[PDB]
From a paper:
Here we show that by fine-tuning the RoseTTAFold structure prediction network on protein structure denoising tasks, we obtain a generative model of protein backbones that achieves outstanding performance on unconditional and topology-constrained protein monomer design, protein binder design, symmetric oligomer design, enzyme active site scaffolding and symmetric motif scaffolding for therapeutic and metal-binding protein design. We demonstrate the power and generality of the method, called RoseTTAFold diffusion ([name]), by experimentally characterizing the structures and functions of hundreds of designed symmetric assemblies, metal-binding proteins and protein binders. We reasoned that [name] might be able to address this challenge by directly generating binding proteins in the context of the target. To enable this, we fine-tuned [name] on protein complex structures, providing a feature as input indicating a subset of the residues on the target chain (called ‘interface hotspots’) to which the diffused chain binds.
To compare [name] to previous binder design methods, we performed binder design campaigns against five targets: [name] H1 Haemagglutinin (HA), Interleukin-7 Receptor-ɑ (IL-7Rɑ), Programmed Death-Ligand 1 (PD-L1), Insulin Receptor (InsR) and Tropomyosin Receptor Kinase A (TrkA). Full BLI titrations for a subset of the designs showed nanomolar affinities with no further experimental optimization, including HA and IL-7Rɑ binders with affinities of roughly 30 nM. We solved the structure of the highest affinity Influenza binder, HA_20, in complex with [name] HA using cryo-EM. Raw electron micrographs revealed a well-folded HA glycoprotein with clearly discernible side, top and tilted view orientations suspended in a thin layer of vitreous ice. The 2D class averages further show clear secondary structure elements corresponding to both [name] HA, as well as the HA_20 binder bound to the stem. The 3D heterogenous refinement without symmetry revealed full occupancy of all three HA stem epitopes by the HA_20 binder. A final non-uniform 3D refinement reconstruction with C3 symmetry yielded a 2.9 Å map of the HA/HA_20 protein–protein complex and corresponding 3D structure that almost perfectly matches the computational design model (0.63 Å, Fig 6f,g; the sidechain interactions at the interface are very different from the closest structure in the PDB). Over the binder alone, the experimental structure deviates from the [name] design by only 0.6 Å. A high-resolution cryo-EM structure of one of these designs in complex with influenza HA shows that [name] can design functional proteins with atomic accuracy.
Residue numbers in the entry:
A (entry chain Z), B (entry chain Y), C (entry chain X): 1 to 65
D (entry chain H), E (entry chain I), F (entry chain G): 9 to 173
G (entry chain B), H (entry chain C), I (entry chain A): 11 to 331
Amino acid sequence: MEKEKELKEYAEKIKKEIGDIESVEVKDGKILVKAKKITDKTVDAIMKLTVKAARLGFKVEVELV
Amino acid sequence: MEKEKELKEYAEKIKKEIGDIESVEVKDGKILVKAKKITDKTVDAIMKLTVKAARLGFKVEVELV
Amino acid sequence: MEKEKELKEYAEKIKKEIGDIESVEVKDGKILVKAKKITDKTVDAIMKLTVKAARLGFKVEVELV
Amino acid sequence: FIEGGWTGMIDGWYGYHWQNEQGSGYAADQKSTQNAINGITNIVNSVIEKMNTQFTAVGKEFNNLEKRMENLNKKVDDGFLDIWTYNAELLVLLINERTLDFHDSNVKNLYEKVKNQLRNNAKEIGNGCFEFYHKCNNECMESVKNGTYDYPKYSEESKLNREKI
Amino acid sequence: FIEGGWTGMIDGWYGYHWQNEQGSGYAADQKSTQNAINGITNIVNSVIEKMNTQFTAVGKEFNNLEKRMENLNKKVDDGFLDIWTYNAELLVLLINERTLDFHDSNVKNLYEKVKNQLRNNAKEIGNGCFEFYHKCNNECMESVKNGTYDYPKYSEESKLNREKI
Amino acid sequence: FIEGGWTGMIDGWYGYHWQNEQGSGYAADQKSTQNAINGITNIVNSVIEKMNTQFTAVGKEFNNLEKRMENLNKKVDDGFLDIWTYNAELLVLLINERTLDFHDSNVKNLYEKVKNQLRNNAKEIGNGCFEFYHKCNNECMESVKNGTYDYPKYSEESKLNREKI
Amino acid sequence: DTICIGYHANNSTDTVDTVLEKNVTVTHSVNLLEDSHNGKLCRLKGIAPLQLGKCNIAGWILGNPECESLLSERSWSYIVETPNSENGTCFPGDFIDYEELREQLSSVSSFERFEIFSKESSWPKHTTGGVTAACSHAGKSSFYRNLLWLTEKDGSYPNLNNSYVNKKGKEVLVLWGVHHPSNIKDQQTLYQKENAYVSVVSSNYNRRFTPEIAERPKVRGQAGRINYYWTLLKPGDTIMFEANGNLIAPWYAFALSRGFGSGIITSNASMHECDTKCQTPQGAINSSLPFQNIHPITIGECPKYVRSTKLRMVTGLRNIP
Amino acid sequence: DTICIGYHANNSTDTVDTVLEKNVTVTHSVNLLEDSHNGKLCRLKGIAPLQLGKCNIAGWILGNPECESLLSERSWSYIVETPNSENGTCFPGDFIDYEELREQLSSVSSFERFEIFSKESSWPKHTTGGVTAACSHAGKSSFYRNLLWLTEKDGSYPNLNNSYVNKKGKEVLVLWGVHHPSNIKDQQTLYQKENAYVSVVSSNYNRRFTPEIAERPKVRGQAGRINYYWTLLKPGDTIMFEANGNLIAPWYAFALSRGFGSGIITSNASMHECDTKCQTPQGAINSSLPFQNIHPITIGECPKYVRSTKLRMVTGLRNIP
Amino acid sequence: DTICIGYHANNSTDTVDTVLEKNVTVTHSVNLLEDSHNGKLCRLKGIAPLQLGKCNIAGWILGNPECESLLSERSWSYIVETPNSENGTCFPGDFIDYEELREQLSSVSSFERFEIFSKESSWPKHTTGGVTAACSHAGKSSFYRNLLWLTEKDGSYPNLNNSYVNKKGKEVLVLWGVHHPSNIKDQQTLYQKENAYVSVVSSNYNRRFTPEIAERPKVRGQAGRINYYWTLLKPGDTIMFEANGNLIAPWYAFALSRGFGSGIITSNASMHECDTKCQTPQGAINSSLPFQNIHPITIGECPKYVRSTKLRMVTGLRNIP
Ligand SMILES: *[C@@H]1O[C@H](CO)[C@@H](O[C@@H]2O[C@H](CO)[C@@H](O[C@@H]3O[C@H](CO)[C@@H](O)[C@H](O)[C@@H]3O)[C@H](O)[C@H]2NC(C)=O)[C@H](O)[C@H]1NC(C)=O
Ligand SMILES: *[C@@H]1O[C@H](CO)[C@@H](O[C@@H]2O[C@H](CO)[C@@H](O[C@@H]3O[C@H](CO)[C@@H](O)[C@H](O)[C@@H]3O)[C@H](O)[C@H]2NC(C)=O)[C@H](O)[C@H]1NC(C)=O
Ligand SMILES: *[C@@H]1O[C@H](CO)[C@@H](O[C@@H]2O[C@H](CO)[C@@H](O[C@@H]3O[C@H](CO)[C@@H](O)[C@H](O)[C@@H]3O)[C@H](O)[C@H]2NC(C)=O)[C@H](O)[C@H]1NC(C)=O
Ligand SMILES: *[C@@H]1O[C@H](CO)[C@@H](O[C@@H]2O[C@H](CO)[C@@H](O)[C@H](O)[C@H]2NC(C)=O)[C@H](O)[C@H]1NC(C)=O
Ligand SMILES: *[C@@H]1O[C@H](CO)[C@@H](O[C@@H]2O[C@H](CO)[C@@H](O)[C@H](O)[C@H]2NC(C)=O)[C@H](O)[C@H]1NC(C)=O
Ligand SMILES: *[C@@H]1O[C@H](CO)[C@@H](O[C@@H]2O[C@H](CO)[C@@H](O)[C@H](O)[C@H]2NC(C)=O)[C@H](O)[C@H]1NC(C)=O
Ligand SMILES: *[C@@H]1O[C@H](CO)[C@@H](O)[C@H](O)[C@H]1NC(C)=O
Ligand SMILES: *[C@@H]1O[C@H](CO)[C@@H](O)[C@H](O)[C@H]1NC(C)=O
Ligand SMILES: *[C@@H]1O[C@H](CO)[C@@H](O)[C@H](O)[C@H]1NC(C)=O
Ligand SMILES: *[C@@H]1O[C@H](CO)[C@@H](O)[C@H](O)[C@H]1NC(C)=O
Ligand SMILES: *[C@@H]1O[C@H](CO)[C@@H](O)[C@H](O)[C@H]1NC(C)=O
Ligand SMILES: *[C@@H]1O[C@H](CO)[C@@H](O)[C@H](O)[C@H]1NC(C)=O
Ligand SMILES: *[C@@H]1O[C@H](CO)[C@@H](O)[C@H](O)[C@H]1NC(C)=O
Ligand SMILES: *[C@@H]1O[C@H](CO)[C@@H](O)[C@H](O)[C@H]1NC(C)=O
Ligand SMILES: *[C@@H]1O[C@H](CO)[C@@H](O)[C@H](O)[C@H]1NC(C)=O
Ligand SMILES: *[C@@H]1O[C@H](CO)[C@@H](O)[C@H](O)[C@H]1NC(C)=O
Ligand SMILES: *[C@@H]1O[C@H](CO)[C@@H](O)[C@H](O)[C@H]1NC(C)=O
Ligand SMILES: *[C@@H]1O[C@H](CO)[C@@H](O)[C@H](O)[C@H]1NC(C)=O
């Protein structure tokens, strides 16, 4: 509950800040990241998101648009 | 002594139950399995035998006839 | 201080005893071994030197002359 | 190059599928299957032997003025439990990676075995199959499967058909 | 065969560099990059999930006649600290080796993908590059990058130029 | 493809055996042997450095009314001993697998080095040997061993003899 | 004509995990984690446990009336308490070093319960009895079976003076108590003197006890207390009891054998005729797997306990039809 | 026309280690070791800690004058002592089972400080006071706030006799002390009798104390000693105090709540308005990394502490321009 | 003309193990497990150990006659007891907190044995002696060297009253005992009063002892007991002794230095002139390997102890001629 809400807020922040990411869908124990490009900025953001999801019980799967 | 006798009884049971195994020779710290085929049934039996031998001090070697 | 001096003495002993080694330079946290050949004797000496350097804080790098 | 296993090969782990004018079917590669089984059993024995039998581990009682000792005992128990859960799960992951790499390497080695046997007498298809330029009867298939393929025996016909193609 | 990465390929981890009469540049191999990212994230989640949260671990006080208990408590603390430092550093080394082997294997698999697509229509250079015998326009490059290279379409021209060379 | 080592190559870990009209013998590949030795020493330093020195660990005495504390102390000792024996043996197994794979990879890389140097000027034998189509004198052997083989220099003779064969 | 190289596949749905990959489907796998059990208490290597059905270690060793049936037991493989083991010390008091006694008893594996001091002849000048409401049994006041409460006889409590020489080849567990009345009138009524002492000594034991008389909150209806003490006699030692009063003398003592693998567990399960080599409070384990997630506390040769929910190792190929 | 296969490279200088290789340069890496902190004390999950600015656990719980401001605190997330927490027991003596009291208090998370025995009405036949130079405050002799020193009134010290019935739903922590004068003249002056006793009992507590009069080395100018004792009342229990003298009676007691995650830490840092989910003596931690090398002792949900100085895992390729 | 690629081989028979493979033959290997030792006791970093040849810690610190030669020792690197260290407390009794004293002494590394109370002048009104059959030496009754047994002089035992001010820069270990006769006649004969007390106090120590007279089983021919006590004086503290009787006064005390790496080991081995950086009860270790399987208990900088019998890591190729 609280973990999912915090991850949703963080995902909204990331989607706003990182223009190379299309969307970040937190749902049902996994975060689905739909990236448009894989650059240094995007990889750093995705690894930060993965570290954030861990210990919150969420796996991260990345799709390249 | 007791471990080897128990393994001998188990090996006799296996050789009777599994028709794809030719023989099971428990001797001198190792169980020599002479299999005729490697099917799902035989692999399951051999892995059960390997788990049984472990902690009884016996290694398992498999020969394909 | 003391570790480096002990390693220097050991390196001098090795350089005297092992004719297949050109020199052994202990300096600044690493021992630089300049071997002329890699034989069983030289490999044994170099591995003994590596084990000796460890826990004395020195890495060993080998150059083949 | 090999995409997916065979549901029809009911015998053996790795093997061959073949077809010619005389017949078709599956057959296990006995040597590689035997080595794979022995390796898997070695992995299992390493996993189980290296774990010692857990003997009687009943808990202790502490009175109301031994809270520090009770907490130290619980700390020891929890620390050992954490360490051993970590060890068990990490060991499982490591041995699973090792085993899957082992199976993939075995399949690759079998493929290379066949390729070395056949040299240029067969067209290599990038899906795990070899097409013989010469006609390969049951004796030829058995020779290839057993690693005793007589390359020069078929060299003339294979070269003739390869040039024709 | 590939010596060093490209500083110009700002997008993707592994990809292609190409040049023809129409243009040149870099492009990422989306499928392999996606799989690599998913694998790396799996490694990160395995590393972090398998570590439990450390909860309150304040120390204990002992009086002048409880030196044995104090030393036992310190022994437990130091033993757990040693074990966990060892576990952390060994885990880092193991996962680093696994990850670097994973990246090398991905690059090798991409190279083999291109080679299987091109067969003998291109000269294989032992530096990670393929030289087409036939002229390869932008459509051909896109087909090769996407794994849909039409081999028979260029077979005649490639054979003609290869024989000429 | 390489079945068994050489008992005659008294110098170096990996190397070459060669024979021509001028002579024959063994020679070590200095670069690969040096890299292998450095890797092995890195493994040894990782194994030994990551283990801390064991300092004074004398046991404790307990009276007849401290049986719980004595059993807790023995429990801590036995748990740490089990964990460290497991760690030592598992580490040995892991590093042995890593080292043997490392040596096999080094031999394979050396073989690929020679193959890339020789291209199609030599017949590749599936036992770890290359047969030159052109005559290869001592200078040619030294060039091949040092990775400076002049491929175009022998292309005409190699092609002539390969076509003749 | 063609020959292909491939590998086995089947209708298995076993799944395993790696560092790179998760939910990998494999043809065959071995589950290294044991999660099933008989759900019963079993004879550990052929010997039944000691079932303290209604009472805990204190009540059994002191022998309160509510588990008198345990006095016929002589040997066991492990000791079983139940979550509702309420009948401990029927008379309120502090069982001194009780946890240490539990630790000692966890390794006994056998005892002989013998009358250390004869009730009829050991105390000819004192009143042998001690029925108290706190230990009421079957509607009547009663008292522990292994302890004897000595009180004044014919208007006096002469100096108590007795000793026992250990003629067993085994350690003898001696238990006694010291009575702490609520008020001075109880002291005078029972022992006829306000200031009495209890002294117990052996080769490696030396204690003196003094009653402490004070009004207390009632526990089980008693404003007094009995502190319970114990000691082990080495096979050749002698134990000497002296008391001016307030002694609740030892009546039965346990000649203790020692063994390996015994322990004490709190269990809700029922006893059954099955045998086992491993036992847990929830039930017996009957597998040779290396790990289990059933219960932290085990007796016998058992798998290592882990928090994991699944430990499957690959013993087959990737299953990819 | 040509197509090449390659991989990414950049201007990164991150370096990682393997078993075979060291100082490997990689395009990107994740540092699994947390080594930065706020350098402040923070509100753990929104609740401020208990800051014992000048006094330690003993001084706070006994309530010596030099940290009187702590008597207004009721709840906290953790307890903070400072390296200069000198003001403990202002009057010298042995705080019995003090470390056990620290262990108990580490998990309280809240208390109600209530007057267990009214000063005016609970001791009508005794002198209520106890100002001593050892606990001097603001230039005047004083005494603990949570303890009441009873002495003779009008030339006598009648038998003290008082009790408290726990009507809270919570455990009540009761603290008292026994005075051990330096010489018999102090005993006669304060309590009017040479041989006095203190007796404290409850359902699960039974102690008797006797003063021990002897010349001692002076500590804080006092040749006497006050031994400090404590006990917890179960939610429904009663505690009874009897004393012929030498009692330093309980005045305030703590009805203790219980919680999870609380602890005691010695810290030099300053308090601030920031929030945190993890706290260390050096400062708060604000990251989700698995490991940290900041401090062994942590409160809250914190990373595992290791001695490592860098734990970087590869999340990229080898960087080889 | 041909060129082949291959690898080294030799006549080695070293064998190693992997997860997949066992008994793999390799050209060269490093044994990470140390299993050889000098089989002697050695000077740890140049300083010889303290060899308690015939007596244990108790006998040495109390200084019983049978290891009087140890009274000339001043410094050591570690303490060695032998499996036959029988001569402890020559007079039977309970050495209180003896294990804690062993723990304290394990870290001393040096002491000065000085006469804390002069025998001739400190007790002018008491009889200085104490020869007892239990501590018989060389055919004559004797007594500890570090303790002084005070008894009545000229028909009385006046109030004992003495103190020592610690003028060392080091902690002073003070040991004393309290005599518990077997019967009242011994009490009257030695101390001339039935009810005597012993009182020992310091800034952080406060105990009172009372003799307990009772018939006991004979140990070493004695029906009495001497309980042995000890305490450490902080560098600036004072210790005061008062006794009405039953005191076995301190005679010599140890000004203790403190160090690192010291410990106590039970060893059967012989002392020799060799030096070492690691010591085990079986013998000294002289290698830099990471692991050893010689003995769990080690002193100095030693390898980690494991149960393994062989730990060989590959440093070469597969040996396949
Ligand atoms: C053996 O254990 C049983 C179960 O614990 C004891 O029976 C229980 O005894 C308590 C205390 O006497 C009873 O509680 C009391 O009930 C009365 C009313 O009857 C009430 O006035 C008191 O305030 C208190 O609540 C409890 O009801 C009773 N339970 C049962 C099922 O009988 C028994 O006394 C123990 N006997 C021995 C010899 O150890
Ligand atoms: C609260 O804690 C403070 C700090 O520990 C106490 O003040 C300190 O008290 C000691 C002992 O009285 C002082 O040391 C003494 O100083 C006198 C000279 O004034 C000297 O003759 C003695 O030998 C001893 O050295 C110390 O100076 C003093 N420090 C300060 C900064 O005041 C205070 O007494 C404690 N009060 C309570 C109620 O706990
Ligand atoms: C120092 O230690 C030695 C060895 O432990 C002591 O000598 C031993 O003393 C015991 C007890 O006195 C002797 O056992 C007794 O022997 C007599 C017959 O002589 C027997 O009647 C008793 O029942 C008991 O068995 C033992 O024989 C004796 N051993 C030797 C080799 O002398 C010695 O008394 C100790 N001295 C001091 C000052 O600590
Ligand atoms: C993949 O693995 C995950 C985790 O091991 C499995 O997670 C379960 O997924 C189902 C379906 O969404 C849920 O109902 C369960 O609650 C999940 N369990 C847990 C523990 O999270 C998932 O089932 C696996 N998928 C496959 C196809 O094997
Ligand atoms: C290679 O790794 C070593 C050890 O991790 C690094 O060691 C440092 O080297 C510099 C330069 O000699 C010294 O000033 C430091 O004191 C060394 N640190 C330690 C902890 O020993 C070294 O810097 C690394 N080199 C590169 C190029 O990354
Ligand atoms: C293979 O490894 C096993 C186990 O490490 C070795 O076992 C020994 O085998 C011999 C011959 O049968 C026995 O005499 C020993 O008692 C066995 N030892 C143990 C500990 O079981 C075996 O020697 C090894 N074989 C080779 C060729 O190295
Ligand atoms: C799997 O296939 C075998 C062989 O046809 C069959 O006997 C078995 O019932 C099948 N199992 C499942 C679960 O479909
Ligand atoms: C009473 O004590 C005397 C010694 O004082 C002893 O001889 C006697 O045996 C004791 N009485 C009993 C019944 O043990
Ligand atoms: C204990 O057993 C009883 C009887 O079967 C049952 O009602 C109860 O739920 C059990 N409790 C537990 C915790 O197993
Ligand atoms: C273990 O379970 C199997 C299968 O139910 C059974 O045949 C065997 O007798 C059991 N062993 C014991 C010791 O109960
Ligand atoms: C690395 O390159 C990027 C892109 O040109 C640049 O923005 C950044 O400042 C560079 N960083 C360093 C440390 O040179
Ligand atoms: C004094 O003790 C009596 C019982 O002896 C009790 O009734 C009374 O309440 C006590 N006095 C006080 C003030 O508690
Ligand atoms: C503690 O804080 C004070 C004040 O900032 C500072 O002077 C002192 O150095 C600090 N000490 C430590 C150990 O942090
Ligand atoms: C953690 O640090 C970041 C960056 O400074 C900040 O934005 C965030 O608010 C911090 N979180 C907390 C709980 O202080
Ligand atoms: C191995 O070979 C070397 C070189 O010939 C020889 O010196 C040595 O004695 C041999 N060792 C054994 C054990 O045969
Ligand atoms: C005896 O005690 C007095 C104080 O009561 C003290 O002054 C005197 O020094 C003591 N005697 C000795 C010998 O210490
Ligand atoms: C101890 O040393 C003695 C003398 O060398 C010897 O007889 C005895 O067997 C040794 N015992 C042990 C356990 O080493
Ligand atoms: C260790 O052993 C070697 C070989 O016997 C010897 O030369 C060396 O002096 C020994 N070292 C010590 C400290 O005894």
